[PDB]
Amino acid sequence: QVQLQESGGGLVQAGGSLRLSCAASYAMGWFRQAPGKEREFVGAIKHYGDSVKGRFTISRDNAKNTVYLQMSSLKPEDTAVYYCAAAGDYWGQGTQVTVS
Amino acid sequence: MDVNPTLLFLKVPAQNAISTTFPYTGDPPYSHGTGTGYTMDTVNRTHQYSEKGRWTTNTETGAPQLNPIDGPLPEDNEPSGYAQTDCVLEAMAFLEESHPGIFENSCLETMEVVQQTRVDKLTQGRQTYDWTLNRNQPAATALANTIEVFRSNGLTANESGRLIDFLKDVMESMDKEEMEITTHFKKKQRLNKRSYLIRALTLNTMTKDAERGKLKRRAIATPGMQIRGFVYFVETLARSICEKLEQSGLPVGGNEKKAKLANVVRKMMTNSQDTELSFTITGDNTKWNENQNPRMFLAMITYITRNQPEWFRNVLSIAPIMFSNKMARLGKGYMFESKSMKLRTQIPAEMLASIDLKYFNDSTRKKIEKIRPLLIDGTASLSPGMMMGMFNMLSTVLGVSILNLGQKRYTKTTYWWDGLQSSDDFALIVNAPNHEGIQAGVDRFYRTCKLLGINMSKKKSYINRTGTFEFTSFFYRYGFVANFSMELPSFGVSGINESADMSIGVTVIKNNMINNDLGPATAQMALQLFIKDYRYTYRCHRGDTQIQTRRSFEIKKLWEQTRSKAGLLVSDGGPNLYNIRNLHIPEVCLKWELMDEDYQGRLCNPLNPFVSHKEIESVNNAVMMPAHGPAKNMEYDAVATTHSWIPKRNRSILNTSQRGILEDEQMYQKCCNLFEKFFPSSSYRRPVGISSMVEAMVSRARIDARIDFESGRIKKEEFAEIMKICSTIEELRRQ
Amino acid sequence: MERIKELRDLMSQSRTREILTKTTVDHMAIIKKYTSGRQEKNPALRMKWMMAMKYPITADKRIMEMIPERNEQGQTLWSKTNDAGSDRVMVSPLAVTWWNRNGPTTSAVHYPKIYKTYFEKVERLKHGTFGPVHFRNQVKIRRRVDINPGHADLSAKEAQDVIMEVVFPNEVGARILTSESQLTITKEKKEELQDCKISPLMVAYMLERELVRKTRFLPVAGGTSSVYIEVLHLTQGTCWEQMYTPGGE
Amino acid sequence: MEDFVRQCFNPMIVELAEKAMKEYGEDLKIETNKFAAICTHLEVCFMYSDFHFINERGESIIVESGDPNALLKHRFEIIEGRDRTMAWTVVNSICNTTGAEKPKFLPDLYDYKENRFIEIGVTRREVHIYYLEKANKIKSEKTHIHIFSFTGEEMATKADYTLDEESRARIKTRLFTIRQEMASRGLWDSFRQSERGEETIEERFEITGTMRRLADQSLPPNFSSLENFRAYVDGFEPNGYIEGKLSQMSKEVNARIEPFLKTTPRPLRLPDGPPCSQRSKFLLMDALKLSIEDPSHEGEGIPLYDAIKCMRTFFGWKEPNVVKPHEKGINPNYLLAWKQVLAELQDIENEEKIPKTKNMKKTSQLKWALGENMAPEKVDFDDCKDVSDLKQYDSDEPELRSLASWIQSEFNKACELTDSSWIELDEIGEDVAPIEHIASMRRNYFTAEVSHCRATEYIMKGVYINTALLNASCAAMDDFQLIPMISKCRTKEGRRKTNLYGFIIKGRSHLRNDTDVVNFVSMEFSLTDPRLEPHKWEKYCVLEIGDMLLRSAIGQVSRPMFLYVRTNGTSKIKMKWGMEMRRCLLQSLQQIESMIEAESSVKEKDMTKEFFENKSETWPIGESPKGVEEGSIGKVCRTLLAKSVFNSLYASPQLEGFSAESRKLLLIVQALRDNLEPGTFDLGGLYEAIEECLINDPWVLLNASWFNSFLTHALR
RNA sequence: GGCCUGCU
RNA sequence: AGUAGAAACAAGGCC
C-alpha cells in the first residue's frame, strides 16, 4: 500500500549540500547503505545518528506527503548505495549520493 | 584483744550484715594473656560430658560431631548431656497444656516482628566476629563488610532492606562454589565452599575479665554476623514466650525478680497447711551451658512452631541447625619465653593442630592431644552443647518447663514443688507432708532435670526451711535485705564526660537510695566523696584553693571574673549545692538562677565546638557494665553544655595494616553529614527507601532552592545557579 | 548554596563519588555507624587515665578559628592533629574553661523553654514544703509506677509523629495526626520553639522525653503519684518517712 | 507488548517507569500493560510540564527551547517521577511554604499562578466518569483536576484549563498517535481493562541446598531427615514417657539430703609452708611521719618543697648502711639510690624555685631497681624453634605459705584511734529538710568516730600515692620521676600539719593493657627494727639512716631510725582501684547506718545519739584469751572500715573466691543457728571449693582463721 | 641520633 | 630482681 520514491541524490563536492526528498503514496525514517555494508540509521521523524548529527535535518510536509533530508557539510563517508526512505515495513528503492 | 569482724555475725544475722562479705572495694581479677587454654578446656569438657553419645562426620564441613541425644541414661551424679527427645517434648507439651495458647500467640507476634523487622536492627549490638577479617569488630562494621562482600559476589537481595531478605541471601551464600574476600597487608582471595561454611559457622573465643566471685578465669564466645539474625528471631520468640510465664525471671529486672520471688514463696508456704512441711533449695546448675545441646533447642522450637506457616518454622529452625554444627576458634594463641636466650615468641592458635608438643606443659599438652581430633582448619567443632549463654531465653524456657512439671497434677503424689528459674540459678520451694515426702520430691526433681541435660550443682546448693534463701546475690530472710556492696563499684566517675559523669553519679546515689536502701547520712557521704573524686579527676577544684594543676589558672580567672560565684558549675570550679533533696535535678538547672548571664550564655552556646550529637539513641544513654551482671544502659538527665564533649579515641589504628578503615570512616562520616544537612531527620528517624544518595540530595536541592526562593534568601541568580549545578553533578554521576 | 557545593566537591573525588552512587538510602544507618572504635569496657579507668594527657578531648575544626592556640602563659588550648577517624581535632580541657570566660556569648533565655522537664522539676522542688520526720517501719511493696510527671498520655511511636511534625514538618510523610490533643500539642510546641536554635536532635529528644509516657517498677510505700515518685528517695526510707508536698500542689 | 516501550519512548522515561515498577515490588513479566499505561501518564506529565516557563510576571513564557539565562523557571513542577518518600517531601514542603492544604493522595504537578496542584490522569475510559471517580477518591479537594481520554476530549471543573490550547492539541495528537499505533500493534483485547488492583504475596523461606543437609545432621540419633523429625513432632503426644525413664533410670541418681548439725561442720584447713610476707605498696603499721605544721590543705602546696622542708625538720642523719638485705637483690644498689635521692633533693634545694615535678637520672642503680631492659625481646617463631629452653610461661599454682601473726596485729592497730583527723570532707548544699539535718548529724558522728583512725590515714596514703603514680606514669612515660609520700592532717589543737613518709621513684610506664605493670621503688622511714619479724620483710631491703629522739619519761629514747626500701609494681587497674579507696568509708558506714536504722525501726525514734554516747549496746568485734570481747558502735565502725581498707589493699582472686565460697557456708551456718533444719547435698565439695582459694595471701588466710574462730564460737 | 602509637 | 598468678608485664612496631 505505501510506495515510496526518493529524489535529490547525486555527485557532490566535500563540504557541499544536498536535499533528499521522498514522495509517498505514519512515522518516517531515512536510512543509508554503503557498498560494503548493511543498513545504517540516519534520521527519523526527530532523531539523528551520531555520524550525521548537526550536519543533517529531517522534515516532512504531511500536505505534500513528502519527507525531506537536508544534508549539509558533506563528507566522503556519507557516500552510500543508497539513501533509502522508509515508512513504519515499507522501503524505498533508494537514491545514490556520492561525496568526493 | 584481737579484732575479728566475722564474730559480728554472732549477734547480727548473716543476711542483715551480708554486705561485709563482699570485697568489692579492690581491683577485680583480670586475665593477662591468651584464652586459648580455657577454650580448649571448655571444648574438651563439653565433649567428655557427652562421651557416650554417637560420633559422625558432617558431609559439608567434614568435622566430627558428637550426638548424645537419646543416649544411655546416666548412672551417676556427674554432669551429663544425654537429654532424651521424648522427655523434653513431653515437658513442652505439659507446659503448653498448663498454659494453653502460649506457643500459638508467641509465634504470631514473632511472625509479625520477623516479617516487619529491618536489617539495621543488627547494628544495635556489641562486638561481633567479622569473618571477612577473622576478628572481632563492632556490629555495624561487620555487617557493612559482610553486605559489601555479598554485593560483590552477586547476593543483593539484602538491598530490599529486610532482615528476612538478608537471611535469604546468607543461606544462598552457603550454596556458592567460590566467594571472594578482601585483605590488606589490597588482595582479593577466593574462599571455596567448605572454607566459607566453616568461616560462617565459627565462633571467636575470648577471656572474660572483671568477673568477681571465683578464683579461676572462664572463656566466652562471640558469633558471626550470618547467624545473628536467626538468633535475634529465636530470642524474640523466647522472650515473647517467657513474658507469659510467671515462673521465669530472665526477661525482667531485679526488683521484678524480688517481687516474683516473694510472691512464689508466700504462695507456696501460705497454701501449705500445718501438716505440710516446706523446704527451699538455693540451687545452682553446674556446667549449665556445656550440657545444653542445640538439637534439643531445635526440637523445642519445632514443637513450639507446630501448625504454623512452613517459612516461619524454617527461619526459626535455621539457628539451632547452625549451632549444632558450630565451630569455635581456639583463641589468640600461646606465648613462649626462652630465658637462656632471653626472648619471647607468640604462636597463633591455628598452629595447635600441627605444632609439636615439646613446648607445652603436661596439662596443656594433654588438652591439645585430646582436642586435636576435633580441629578442622584451625577451629574446633563444638556440636555437643552451647558455649556461653547465647540461648539464655530458651534455657530459661526449659527450666520453667521443669519447674511447672511439678504442679501436683503431674507429680501424682502428696509432694509438689514450684519456684523461680533464671538461667544457671534457681530457687525451688518444695512442700510435702513429711521429710520423706520432701526427700522424694527433691530426688524426683533432680532425676527429671538429669533427663533434660540439666545438672544441679551439689557443691553450690543447699536446702533449708522456707523463709531464708538466696537468688542471684539477692538474700531473702523473711523479706529481701539490701546489700549495697554490688553497686559500690558504680559510685565513682563513670567516665563518659564531665556533665554526664556528674549526672550519672547523682542519679546512681538516688537510685541506690530508692532500691538498695542506702541511708541518708551514707548518701551524703557518698555525695561528698564523689564530688572530691570528680574534682580530683577532671582537675576542676573549688577555685578558691591554691591547688596548682594544669587547669587551675583558667578556672581561677573565671572565678575572679564571675560576680555570683555560687552559680559556677563544679566542672568550672564552683561550689557544690547538691544534697539529698537535689539528687534528681541536673547541675545546670539547679544553678541556673545563680549564674551570671555572660557565663550562662558562654556555657550553653549551641555553636560550641565541643558538643557532638550523633543519633537519638546516643543522646543521654550511657552504657555502664554493672558488677556481677551483663552490660546495661542508663538514661541520665543532663543539659547539653560545653562540658558535654566526647573523649579522644584510641588512635592506635595508624600503626596497623588496617589503616584504610580510618579513611573510609572519614569519607562515610562526611557523606552522612552532607545527607543530614540535606535530610535533617536522618538522625532521629533513620531514612528508608531504595534510591541512592545523590538522587535524593540533588532532587531535594532542586526543590528546596525553588521553594526557599518562593519565600526566602535565594534569588533568581542563585536559584538558576543551583539548578545548573544540580545538572552538573547529574552529568558527573553519569560519568 | 553551600550545601550543594560541598556535595559537588565530594562527587569530584572518585572514592566519595562511588560511595554516594552505590550506597542506597536504607544503608544510611549502617555506614554512619561504620567505625573502628570499639565501645569502651572500662570507661572510668581510661577517663582517669586520659585526663592526665595533654589534649584529651575532641572538638570540631572550627575551634581553631574561635579560640587562640595558647592562653596568656602559653598553655596550649587546642592542637591541629585530627582525631583517628574524624576531621575533629584533639584539644585540651582548658579550651572548655576558656570558652566559659572569654568565648562567644548568646541569649540562653530559651533553654528553660526547651528543657521543660528539668526546669519544671526545679520549680516544683523550690516551692515544696517539708514536714516532720516520723520513724516507723515502712512496708515497702514493689509496684509499677510512671516516673515521668509530664507525659501527655502518648506512647513512644504515638508522640514520635508529633515530634517530627513539630521539628521536621517536611519529613512526616503519609502521617497527618488525627487526634486533636496531638493537634494542640503541635500548635503549642510549634509556636513556642519557632526560632530556637539549640539543635533539631536535642529538641526532638527532649520533646520525646516530655510527652512520651514511661513506666518502671519500684519499691514504694504510699505516694504512687507521678510528682511524689520523683522525690521517692527523699520521702521514703528504710525506717523513716519524710512528709513532703511538691510546689505543684 | 513491551516491544512498544522498547521502540517509542525515550530512555529517561523507561528507566523512571522501571524504578517506579521496582517501587511497589511487583514483577514486570506478569503484567506489563500497567507499565505502559503509567509510563504514558508520566510522559503526559513531562510534556505538559516542560516547554512551559514563567518570569517575574504571571502569564507563563513559553519557549520551545530554554535559552541560556537565569530565566529558566518552570511553569509546572513535577510531583511524580520520584519515590514516595520524596513525593511526600515535596507535598509537605509546598504546603508549608505555600500555606495551602495538604492532599491525602499523590498529586502530579504544582503551579504558581493559581498556587496549587494538578493530578493528571489519562485513562482508557472516557473522561466524564474517571474525573468524578478520582474526585470522590480525593476528599474535599481544592487542587484542580484535569484528565484526557483517547477519544480526544478534555474536561475540568470550573471550566478551567490552565495554559495554552496548542499544548492541549499537542497532548491529544500524542494521544491519538498512541492509539492508532497500537492499531498497528493490536492491544485493545486487554488495553481498556488490564489492571484490576491485585495486591497479594506469600513469604517464602525455603531450606535447600547445603543448608538442608546440615538440617539433616542436626537431629536425634535415630532420625534421617528434618521432614521426618517434624512429622514425628507434630504427631507426638504425651503418653507418660518421663515416668518410664524415671522408673528405668538407676536409683543411684539421687539428691539425698545430708542433715547439717552442730557437729557436722569442721574447721577450714589452712595451707602449710613458709610464713606469709608483706604485699602492701607502703608501710601501714611501721610508718613514720616528718612534719612541718604548715597551714596548707591536702591538695594545696607543692610536693618537693614540702618534702624537703619536712626532712630538714629532722636532725641526726648518719651515713646509711645495710641492716637487713633484700636476700635476692643487690642491696648496694638500694643504698646508692637512697644517697642519690638525698643528693638530688639538695640539688633542688639549691636552685631558684622548687620544680613542681622532678625527673631523676637513669643510673645503672635504678635501671636494675626499676627492671629496665629486662623484658625479653619479641621475635618470630620461625626464627626460634631449635632453642631447647624455649617453652611456655610458668603457669602453675602459686607457692603455698602459712599464716603468720603479724597480719593480725597489723589489723588490730589499723582499727585504733589516733591523735589527728585524717579526713577533711568537702562541702554540701545547706540542709533544708529535717531528714537532711538528721543525716548531717549522723554523718558528723561517724566522721568524729572514724577520722581519728589509722584506716583513714591508710586510705589517704593510698589515694594520694596511687593518684600521683598514675598521673606521673601518664605524663612522664619515659623518664624516672621522684614523688614524695605526703599526707596532710589536723592536730587536736586544730593546727594543720603535713607528713612525709618517704619517697617513690616511678620508672618507665608505657602501659598499654590494663594488666601491664609499672615498676617503682619505694623508700619509707620507720623505727620498727626488722630483726624481730624478718619473715614479714622478705622482699624489702632495710638500711640504717639515722637516730630519732622522742620525748619520753625514760630520759630520752634516742631510738634508731631505719629506711625500708623495696622494688614494687602496680598496673593501671590497680592504680585506679587504689585511688578509689574512699568508698571503704561508704561500705563501712552504710553497714553501721543499716544497723542503726534496723534497730530504730523497732523503737519509733532515731537511736543514733544514744548509740554513740551511752555506748550501752555492744557487738562481738573480737576475741581475747579470756573470751569474746564486745565493743561500742564506734569500734564496730572502725573495725568494718579497717576490713574494707584491707580488702582494697590486699585484693586478689583468692579473696573473691574465698569470700563467695565462705559466704555460702556462713549462710548455711546461719540457717542452722536459726533452727531452719538446713541440709546439704555435698558439703565436702563446698569445703574443697573454699580450701582451694587459700594459697599465699595473708589477708585471705587471716579471713579463713577468723572464719574458723567464728565457727568454733558459734555452733553452741 | 632524628620521627610515630598507646583499648585496634 | 619485682608485679602477678593457670598467663602475662617487666614498651611495640616502622625504618
Author numbering:
A (entry chain F): 1 to 25, 32 to 51, 58 to 100, 113 to 124
B (entry chain B): 1 to 185, 207 to 756
C (entry chain C): 1 to 249
D (entry chain A): 1 to 716
Quote the study on this structure.
Central to the replication cycle of influenza viruses is the viral RNA-dependent RNA polymerase which transcribes and replicates the viral RNA genome. PB1 houses the polymerase active site, whereas PB2 and PA contain, respectively, cap-binding and endonuclease domains required for transcription initiation by cap-snatching.
Using cryo-EM we determined the structure of 17 polymerase-nanobody complexes at resolutions between 4.5 and 6.7 Å; this is sufficient resolution to accurately position each nanobody bound to the polymerase heterotrimer. The most populous binding site, termed site 1, is on the PA endonuclease with five nanobodies (Nb8198, Nb8199, Nb8200, Nb8203, Nb8209) that bind at an interface formed by the short helix α1 (residues 1–10) and the long helix α6 (170–185).
